[PDB]
Every structure is written in C-alpha cells, then in structure tokens.
Design a protein around this nucleic acid. Structure first.
Ligand SMILES: [Mg+2]
Lengths: 64, 138, 228, 153, 120, 137
RNA sequence: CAGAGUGUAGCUUAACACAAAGCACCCAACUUACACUUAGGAGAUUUCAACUUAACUUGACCGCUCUGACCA
C-alpha cells in the first residue's frame, strides 16, 4: 500500500526544518508535502495563460 | 575544407553531467547561527524510542512477508495459466508469451490524501520556473 | 479443437483513490520520525524570524510577528473543507458505485445467467478464431452495459485460469466445459452509465469477493487479485 | 603443469566477466524488454528518494538487474497567486519537483505485469511513477547543452 | 623453542603461531575457539552451550561476545593456555564486539600475543 | 600431451553461460567462509594436509569409558525453551542487553558446564595433550 | 467426498549429543542508492500416544499437495 515506503525523514546531514503542508491541487485533491514555512495548506492555482484564445475572449468577462 | 576539419575535432570535448541541486548543500546552512540548540534526551525517552524501533523491525518484516507471498501467489497463478494455455492452444500460448509493444510508457500517479472536491475553484495564478541553465564550454 | 471452450475474462481493478490510513504502530513511527527530523534540522527561516521577536520582548520593522503569521495561516486552513475520505456510498453500502472504499482496491463483478442460474463472474467473452486471448479480454470490456471505461491491460500473459465442467445434461463429447483465462487491467477513467447501472455489476474488494463468488471459483480469483 | 592432470586448477578469469577499459545501445528480445527507466517524480524529496530506494531493493529481491540509480535536476516553480482586488500577481509559495530514476534491464515479458503491479500498488501519495523505455535522448538529458556546438551547426 | 610455521606471506591469515583465537559469528550464535596451528581445538566457548545460553538475553549481541570472552579466558587458564594470536580482519578489529571480547580475554589473563621463538 | 583430471576439477559446477545472472560473493567474509570449507574437503591432488597433517589410523578410536547418560530430548528441549522465554520476558534483562551492562555468572556457567559439555571438552583437551595416545595407546 | 503420497521457520540427506544448526531474511546507521560493514530484530519440529529413546521409527490426529468424483 501507500505506507510501504511513505514513513521517512530527511536523510541529509545538514538541512533546514520542513513543516508538513497540505498541497491542494487544482482538482481539489490534497497531498501531504514538506514546506519551508509552517503553513497549514497550500493551494495550486489554475494558470490563465494555458487557456485557449477562443475561451479567453468570452472568459475575459467571466473572469470578472 | 577548413570547416570540415574543425567539425571532426569538435567531438573531442566529452559530455559533462548536469549538477544536482538536491545533493549540493546550500551555503546558508554553514552559518552557526542557524543551528539547533541540540537539547539532550531523557533516559525514559530513549527507552520508548528503542523499544519502538524494535517493534518496527518486526512489523516491517511481516510487511515484507506479505509482499513476498503476494508475488509468489501471482507468479504461480500466472505460470499455471501459461501451462494450461499451451496445452489447450499452443498457437494462442505463443502470442501470450510475447512482449507487449504498447505497454510503455506506463505512467501512474500516487493516491492523494483526500479525493478531489467536485466544485472547487482554485484562485488563478501563474507558474514561473527558476530552473537554471548549465552550458558546457571548452 | 476440443470439448473445452476457451474463454477470456477481464480482471478490471480500480486502484486506491486515497492513501491508506496509517496503523497504530505506523502512527507512532510517523511521530517519532517527525520528532527526529526536527532535532537534527537546522533552524528554518521562519523559526529565526520568531527568535528575533523574542529578543524584542526582552528589550521592551514588521508589524506582523512570526506567531501572528501562523495565526492567519491556521484560520485559512480551518475555513477550507477537505474532500471526505469516506464517501456517502460507504454509508449506504452502495456496491455499484466506484466512489466507495477509496482507500481499498475494487474489482468488477458482473452477474450473468449460466444454465438458468444467476452466477457472479468476471466479465468474459468466448474466444473468436484469429484473435489473441488478450484480444478477447479487451472485447469483454466493450461487450458490456453502456460504459466509457478505459483500461490499461498489463501484459499479454493470462494471470490465472479456472476450469469447470458442464452438468451431465449439457455435458457432451462436443462440449464438456470451458477454460477461462483472466487478464488484469486498470480502470484509468470512466464508469458505467446511469442507464447501464440498473444492476448486474458490483464493485467489491478482495475481502468481499467471497460473498458474491462461488467456492471453487473464488479460490482461483483470489490468487491473482492483489490483497495490497 | 600442462601435462599433469591438475593443469588449469588456478584459472579464474573465465569465472569473472571480462571488462574493457559512446555507449552501446541495448534492446530487448521478443520475450524480454530492453533497458527501462523508472521515473519517480514527487514534490517531496524524501518521498521520491524513499520510493527510489524501495524500487531498487525490490529489484534486487526479484533478481532484476538495476543498471543505474541516479537523480535528475531539481525543478523549481513559483506559484504566483493573484492578490485580492489587485491586477498584479504576487508570489505565494515555491514548489520544487524532485525526480529519481531507477534503470532496470532484462525485465521478462511475462513478469513485467507482476513487477508493475507491485510498484504501482506501493506508490506513496503525491509520487508519480512513469516507466519509459530507455533511449539515447534520455541519457543526453542529464548532460549540459553546448550552445557553441549548436551555433556551428 | 618450537618452530612456528613461517611462510604463507601472500595469503591470509598467517600460520606463524602456536595457538590462535578464532571467533566465529553466525546469524544466531557467537563462538570463540583456541586452536593449535595443527588445526586441533584446545578449548572453546560457544553460545550454543546451555551453560552459557541460559544466562544470556541474546546470543548474537555485544554482550554475548563479551560473555564468550570472559568464559573462554577462564577455560584457557584452566588448560594452561596463556598466549595466543588473534588474526581479525580490519572491520572485525574495529567492531565493538571484538573489542569487548578481546578486553575480556586480556582481563582474564590471556595475553593475545605470543612470545617470539628462540632460534639460538 | 594432456592428462584427464583424476576427479572433479574445482569451479566446474559453476555455469559460465549466465555469468552475469549468478550471485557473486560481494564480501571478503563470504568468500573466506567458502574457501575454508573447500580446504577441509579431501582432494585428489597434492595438498598441504597430506604432507603436514598427522597420519592417524582411519578406524575410529575405541571407546573404553562409561556409557553416556540417558537424556530425554523432548523434555530437555521443553524446559530450556521455557527457561529462555522466562528470561527474555524480564524488561530489566532486555534493558541490560541493550545498554551492554549485562554479564554472565562465571561460577554458574562452570557448574552447568561440568554437567553438560565439560566431559567432552576435557576429552578434547586430553586428546590434544596426548594423554590417550600415551596412556591407552 | 474418496484414494495416494507428504510434513523442521523460506531452503537444507542440519541435528552423534555436548545442541533445535547453517544460510536466506527484517530494521537502524554508512551509501545518491546498491553493495560492504557495524549494531540490532523475528523463529520452526502439526498434535497425542506407542518398548528406554524418538525432528527421525510406529499407529491415529491435523495440515499439505496430487488424482478422480460432485461441480454452468
Ligand atoms: Mg537495506
């Protein structure tokens, strides 16, 4: 299962403290990660540039 | 003619591997200000950590036993089917032992912690990559 | 030829959607590993930013302190609601839905009528000359209730095989029985449509496989079906 | 001595595979795959490294030759989320992507389904498993580019 | 004055001794032997023995290796064996198990170094 | 002119067709363990054991002592297994072993040793000292 | 259900007794990883009797595999 190789720690001799952070993906699924600051959740945003030009013409008003 | 001679000699420079950031320690870490106080541990705590790691050795061993048994069960089941298929239809068996051509690339994603929320609108933004560029120079 | 009908079966599996819940010992080992990580870890940028605030208190320009930032961060997390790991299907025990038992791996079981009897089996289709045995298994997916399911067949070798013999009335020199060869596949995307969801299909885990399958049939299905 | 029955009692080089003191390509037979690359990409460096170690040790248990185990250059991405009631994107967080590659050769045709099942089921959360057949393009991806060479082209 | 088997310079271990201490560590047990250069075993202590095994929590840890040394040292003195050579590998010598086992032998009266042969 | 070997040659079972697939030693200790075992075995070729090893009668040494005592292995194994489980149960025993403070009572060891392996260790010592060779031929 | 063989933990024609052994395994540290090495971890005679003894020979007992029957 997922727990087969999940439980671990940073194996570097010198490393800065990392805090567990829930990364919320665009679909809304969340995965635990290690982040520099003691945040509780991180949300990955939808990138506007990827949007096609036909949609952006009509999504310009929708974005508002 | 001069251009051709140069092209032949260009390959003498061997390729150089791209450094890996993960292995390279950051310089900021060297500073002794960014050092944990290194608090010592109590006697009772060392017992709890030692006994816990003893339990971990055996729990992991049982985990490996199930994985080893699972592969053994699958291998025997697959072999028996291959033996039966050969007897029943040798021509069909020959196809079954061939290597799958369209199998790869095989891409799989780890299971998330929570399932995706149906109605979730992520606040739009932009992804900017800071990856450096390393070019080999004679 | 032979009195054995060659049939190909499909072992369609839905791989875990969510990570499994850590067990008691794993819950302890996880905390110990986190504790050990902190002890051997150098001070983080946020940690140092907080030490400066402590020095300021002893003596007596960022208005927001390190602790103040953490308070704001916590508020946002509490507001956000995570997707339920245990779905509404688990409450209703609706075994016809791909939503239930996200952590576990489900298998597809279809009810077909054989000898005027309702028997749960893996989707199967009779072999047609000129097609590989795995080709038959792929055909089983198409020859089902209306569905958009897409599957990734892993390899061409049969995972397992179950042999049964027809009853005396059906049993004859021409048709004694059938040879069923199973083929594993992963359900990448898609599900049975609402029109085809009336019944005769149940997504079940390995533990629940015995409830629907026969004794001898179950014994062979379990071998290749992964417990993990 | 040559004549004596014990001639050759101390020959050992046949026992050891000869090694010669740019790299030949390897492909597979109709019943075996060629060199394969197992790409373990995960935002958490520990999880990527952890599963790379697990896959390597699993290959040893199955007597599967592991040609090489290494890492790819870390990928850093800046997540600039729109500031409230503002038209200018502001940096919110930096996310690194860490990739570990385990190279295996000689994987059997029949056994491939068994191997993929085991390493697919044990995948940790947030870790992406991509298995690709080895190719010269991949090996050149770990070596720096030569603009000067391209300029001469 | 007895001659030691000199030679064997290109191979390991040396044969230039009258008695040697050999420690055999298995997956489950620890064994220490004192044997003559001719291959005969003079005295031995092993965790397989019930006399030693019943007083040990584990028969494969450092404590077992130290206990074997203490027991073997007593049996050595009773057999009149005061000197022997110990021929470990680089990793065996560094290990704490062999350090503790050697200390027990020396604290038990065994020198672990043999006197030089008297040629004249 | 070549002479056929007078027996199985060393390193002949090793299949050279699949050299890469064979399991290597990987460690000095594993090779040495196998090397010592091979040396002990008898060989058709000339060996150091022949010229330097003592020549003794092949017939087994006559045993002129008292008969061995009768022991019930099933009961003996039962009690010993229960004794070790009792010893290992104690938390103090595990802690002493983990912290490397535990020791064995030398006096108690020798008392049990005399009852169990001591007669066979004294026989080995007497054999090494030549007492049997000189006292009972 | 019936017949047949079969039984030490994963393997072993390990087990004379002085003893359930050797190796294969699992964790931690080292190693990018592997390997090596160090320091740790888990353990079996299916069960009960049969003349002292019996992991071993006898019977039952239980498990195991194989074959045939039942068997859509
Ligand atoms: Mg390891």
């Amino acid at each position: 299962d997922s727990s087969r190789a999940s439980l671990t720690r940073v194996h570097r001799q010198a490393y800065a403290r990392l805090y567990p952070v829930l990364l919320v993906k665009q679909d809304g699924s969340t995965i635990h990660i290690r982040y520099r600051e003691p945040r509780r959740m991180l949300a990955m945003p939808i990138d506007l540039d990827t949007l096609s030009p036909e949609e952006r013409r009509a999504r310009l008003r929708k974005r508002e | 003619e001069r251009l051709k001679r140069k092209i032949r000699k260009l390959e003498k420079a061997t390729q150089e591997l791209i450094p890996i950031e993960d292995f390279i320690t950051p310089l900021k870490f060297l500073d002794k200000a960014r050092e944990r106080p290194q608090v010592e541990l109590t006697f009772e705590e060392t017992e709890r950590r030692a006994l816990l790691l003893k339990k971990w050795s055996l729990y992991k061993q049982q985990e490996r036993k199930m994985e080893r048994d699972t592969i053994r069960a699958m291998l025997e089941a697959q072999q028996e089917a291959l033996e039966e298929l050969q007897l029943e239809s040798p021509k069909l068996h020959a196809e079954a032992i061939k290597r799958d051509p369209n199998l790869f690339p095989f891409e799989k994603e780890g299971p998330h912690y929570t399932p995706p929320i149906p109605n979730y609108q992520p606040p739009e933004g932009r992804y900017n990559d800071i990856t450096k560029v390393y070019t080999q120079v004679e | 030829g032979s009195p054995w009908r060659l049939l190909g079966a499909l072992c369609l599996q839905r791989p875990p959607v969510v990570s499994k819940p850590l067990t008691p010992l794993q819950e302890e080992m996880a905390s110990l590993l986190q504790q050990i990580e902190i002890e051997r870890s150098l001070y983080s940028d946020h940690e140092l930013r907080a030490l400066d605030e402590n020095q300021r208190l002893a003596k007596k320009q960022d208005i927001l302190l390190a602790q103040d930032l953490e308070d704001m961060w916590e508020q946002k997390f509490l507001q956000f609601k995570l997707g339920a790991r245990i779905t509404e299907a688990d409450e209703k025990n609706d075994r016809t839905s791909l939503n239930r038992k996200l952590d576990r791996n489900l298998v597809l079981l279809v009810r077909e009528k054989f000898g005027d009897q309702d028997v749960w089996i893996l989707p199967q289709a009779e072999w047609q000359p000129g097609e590989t045995l795995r080709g038959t298994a792929e055909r089983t997916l198409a020859t089902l209730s209306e569905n958009n399911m897409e599957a990734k067949f892993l390899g061409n070798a049969p995972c397992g095989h179950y042999t049964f013999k027809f009853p005396q009335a059906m049993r004859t020199e021409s048709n004694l029985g059938a040879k069923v060869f199973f083929f594993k596949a992963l359900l990448l995307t898609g599900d049975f449509s609402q029109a085809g969801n009336k019944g005769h299909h149940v997504w079940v885990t390995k533990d629940e496989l015995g409830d629907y399958l026969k004794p001898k049939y179950l014994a062979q299905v379990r071998r290749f079906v992964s417990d993990l | 001595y040559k004549t004596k029955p014990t001639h050759g009692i101390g020959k050992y080089k046949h026992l050891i595979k000869a090694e010669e003191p740019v790299r030949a390509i390897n492909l597979g037979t109709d019943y075996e795959y060629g060199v394969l690359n197992i790409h373990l990409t995960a935002y958490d460096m520990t999880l990527a490294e952890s599963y790379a170690q697990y896959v390597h040790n699993l290959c040893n248990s199955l007597s599967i030759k592991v040609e090489e185990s290494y890492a790819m250059p870390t990928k850093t991405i800046e997540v600039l989320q729109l500031q409230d009631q503002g038209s200018k994107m502001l940096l919110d967080s930096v996310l690194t992507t860490h990739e570990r590659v385990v190279q295996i050769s000689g994987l059997s045709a029949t056994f491939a389904e068994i191997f993929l099942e085991i390493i697919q089921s044990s995948l940790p959360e947030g870790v992406r498993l991509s298995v690709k057949e080895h190719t010269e393009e991949d090996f050149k991806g770990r070596f720096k580019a030569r603009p000067e060479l391209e300029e001469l082209l | 004055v007895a001659r030691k088997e000199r030679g064997w310079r290109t191979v390991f271990p040396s044969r230039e001794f009258w008695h040697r201490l050999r420690v055999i560590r298995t997956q489950h047990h620890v064994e220490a032997l004192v044997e003559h250069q001719n291959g005969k075993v003079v005295v031995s202590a092993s965790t397989r023995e019930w006399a030693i095994k019943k007083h040990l929590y584990s028969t494969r840890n450092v404590v077992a290796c130290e206990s074997i040394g203490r027991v073997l040292a007593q049996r050595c003195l009773e057999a009149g064996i005061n000197f022997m050579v110990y021929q470990p590998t680089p990793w065996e010598a560094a290990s704490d198990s062999m350090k503790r086992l050697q200390s027990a032998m020396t604290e038990g009266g065994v020198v672990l170094r043999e006197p030089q042969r008297i040629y004249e | 002119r070549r002479t056929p070997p007078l027996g199985p040659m060393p390193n002949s079972d090793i299949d050279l067709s699949n050299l890469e697939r064979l399991e290597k030693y990987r460690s000095f200790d594993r090779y040495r363990r196998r090397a010592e075992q091979e040396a002990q075995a008898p060989h058709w070729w000339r060996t150091y054991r022949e010229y330097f090893g003592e020549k003794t009668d092949p017939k087994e040494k006559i045993d002129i002592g008292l008969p061995p005592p009768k022991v019930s292995r099933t009961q003996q194994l039962l009690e010993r297994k229960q004794a070790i489980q009792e010893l290992r149960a104690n938390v103090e025993e595990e802690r002493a072993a983990r912290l490397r403070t535990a020791s064995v009572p030398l006096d108690a060891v020798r008392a049990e040793w005399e009852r169990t392996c001591g007669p066979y260790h004294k026989q080995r010592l007497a054999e090494y000292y030549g007492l049997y060779r000189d006292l009972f031929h």
